[PDB]
């Protein structure tokens, strides 16, 4: 779910960034013909979009740091499982857990961390 939320937020922020670049061009145009009502309206819309995008940045960054915490938890758990066994079983358990997580076979992951 962290993955999905980050994907949706990045999509929305790409949309708003494209909007902002369009508004920058439009404001430069309105300013080149000294049309100040429309220029000021473009600048207002840019201000509002920047506020919304900053809120979006805050929430994305927050979810992203949580995602990094989760990834480190997973990797450190695989390492804690491997570190419990000495010798050739270590990398065996490590690669087994990596393959059991690349296939999202969580039950096999815990099976190989328990006895395997």
């Amino acid at each position: 779910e962290y993955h999905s939320v980050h994907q949706k937020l990045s999509a929305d922020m790409a949309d708003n960034s494209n909007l902002i670049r369009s508004l920058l061009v439009q404001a430069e145009d309105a300013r080149l013909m000294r049309d100040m009502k429309t220029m000021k309206n473009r600048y207002k819309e840019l201000y509002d979009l920047n506020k919304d995008l900053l809120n979006g940045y805050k929430i994305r960054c927050n979810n992203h740091t949580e995602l990094l915490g989760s990834l480190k938890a997973v990797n450190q758990a695989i390492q804690r499982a491997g570190h419990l066994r000495v010798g050739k079983p270590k990398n065996q358990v490590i690669t087994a857990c990596r393959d059991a997580i690349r296939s999202n076979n969580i039950n096999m992951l815990f099976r190989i961390m328990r006895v395997g």
Partner: protein, 475 residues
């Protein structure tokens, strides 16, 4: 006969109005029928469908306000960002005019937003630039989490949302739910998510999906998609290696060879684009792109008979345009076939669905006339080219040349000033204005015009002699 059957058979035969027309009935008759539902969805989304590969507007904002190329000043010959302007007409400082306008043509790029605004709207794209590049179903009512479970509905629904409604965010939501339903094992959903990304702006996040789709199953579609992605990141030599990899997979694909040739022409080394267009010809021999390009190149490198053959080929294959017939007229006249020359220009003037096409045909008829002599007919043709398209700088320049031939110097000066104001990238109006000024005097205007000529066609000869004489007069 039956409603669903007749509608589906209308769909097979690509009617796309009747199909929907019977499904709308069949849906009013029964509020619970998804076959006719997705059939009407297919019909609606295919009346407007256009493949995403050859839709590369980019626009003004992307051109300046978006920086994605890693290298800022890469070696000349590895970035996208022949006959001289004395033979081949030009569009910018360089970039000679091409055959086969495609809606992905950038043909140079502006430097600043002001320059891009204060120029003609269709001087950097096949279409005028843009800042950003009842209803059957309301997108805010359906729960994409439930249509994602049914792939038979989900695929047509995504095609509808993406190509009909152009709702990239909801399309991406549906495609993400669908891909997670398929456990990331179908290349089609990966390609669609990559397209959603690519037109959202995220290129690397799209290249990831296109690479992961190539790993599933090689298809020409994904190869061309990665080619677009790599060209967007200003990486020609990666796109060429990827194209040769694809040709290693598909040994004789025409779209891949044509993409290689397009990249070689954007990099402007025609000596390989002709080779790859010749490979396309060895494969297709009806390809409008390769035939038009090799024909133009054959015409401008003083071989108009081979170009006339290459364009008579397109005439033989049922192509019926205003461009094709004007081209046939130019070729017939310059290849010295005076029997089929002017009837081609007449068919052109007949087929022209614009006011700029008519102006170009009248311009070329004036060229024919001035090649025949009788400068009055060419005078009339250039004036008609002006009357059709007021912003036609070549007509201004040629009409000013004919005026100064008559004797009216002030008319020629004003017309050359207008031409050089409309198209600064051209070199002939500047050179002629400088020449006439120097003939009468006004060495300041002569310098200001000859320097712009040298800025337009920097390897000219008469411009250099003019500049030397002027700088000598200044001491």
């Amino acid at each position: 006969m039956e409603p669903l059957l007749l509608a589906w058979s209308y769909f097979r035969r690509r009617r796309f109005q009747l199909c929907a027309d019977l499904c709308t009935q069949m849906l009013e008759k029964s509020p619970c029928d998804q076959a006719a539902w997705i059939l009407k969805a297919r019909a609606l989304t295919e009346m407007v469908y256009v493949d995403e590969i050859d839709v590369d507007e980019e626009g003004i904002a992307e051109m300046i306000l978006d920086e994605n190329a890693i290298a800022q000043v890469p070696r000349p010959g590895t970035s996208l960002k022949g006959p001289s302007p004395a033979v081949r007409p030009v569009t910018q400082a360089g970039r000679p005019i091409t055959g086969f306008l495609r809606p992905s043509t950038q043909s140079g790029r502006p430097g600043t937003i002001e320059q891009a605004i204060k120029t003609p709207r269709t001087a950097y794209t096949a279409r005028p630039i843009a800042s950003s590049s009842g209803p059957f179903i309301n997108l805010s009512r359906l729960n994409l989490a439930k249509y994602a479970q049914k792939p038979k509905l989900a695929k047509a629904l995504f095609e509808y949302i993406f190509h009909h409604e152009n709702d990239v965010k909801t399309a991406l939501d549906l495609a993400a739910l669908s891909t997670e339903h398929s456990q990331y094992k179908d290349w089609w959903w990966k390609v669609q998510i990559g397209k959603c990304y690519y037109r959202l702006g995220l290129y690397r996040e799209a290249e990831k999906q296109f690479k992961s789709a190539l790993k599933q199953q090689e298809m020409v579609d994904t190869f061309l998609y990665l080619a677009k992605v790599y060209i967007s990141l200003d990486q020609p030599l990666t796109a060429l290696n990827l194209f040769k990899q694809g040709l290693d997979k598909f040994p004789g694909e025409v779209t891949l060879l044509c993409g290689i040739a397009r990249i070689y022409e954007e990099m402007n080394n025609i000596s390989s684009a002709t080779e790859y267009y010749k490979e396309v010809l060895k494969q297709d021999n009806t390809h409008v792109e390769a035939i038009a390009c090799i024909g133009s190149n054959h015409f401008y490198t003083d071989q108009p008979e081979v170009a006339l053959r290459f364009y008579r080929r397109l005439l033989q294959m049922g192509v019926y345009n205003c461009q094709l017939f004007n081209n046939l007229g130019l070729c017939c006249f310059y290849a010295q076939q005076y029997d089929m020359t002017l009837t081609s220009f007449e068919r052109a003037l007949s087929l022209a669905e614009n006011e700029e096409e008519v102006a170009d045909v009248w311009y070329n008829l004036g060229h024919v006339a001035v090649g025949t002599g009788d400068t009055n007919l060419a005078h009339q043709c250039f004036r008609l080219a002006l009357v059709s398209n007021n912003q036609h700088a070549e007509a201004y320049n040629n009409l000013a040349v004919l005026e100064m031939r008559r004797g009216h110097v002030e008319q020629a000066k004003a017309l050359l000033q207008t031409a050089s104001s409309l198209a600064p990238h051209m070199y002939e109006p500047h050179f002629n204005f400088a020449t006439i000024s120097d003939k009468i005097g006004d060495l300041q205007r002569s310098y200001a015009a000859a320097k712009k000529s040298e800025a337009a066609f920097p390897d000219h000869v008469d411009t250099q002699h003019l500049i030397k004489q002027l700088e000598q007069h200044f001491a």
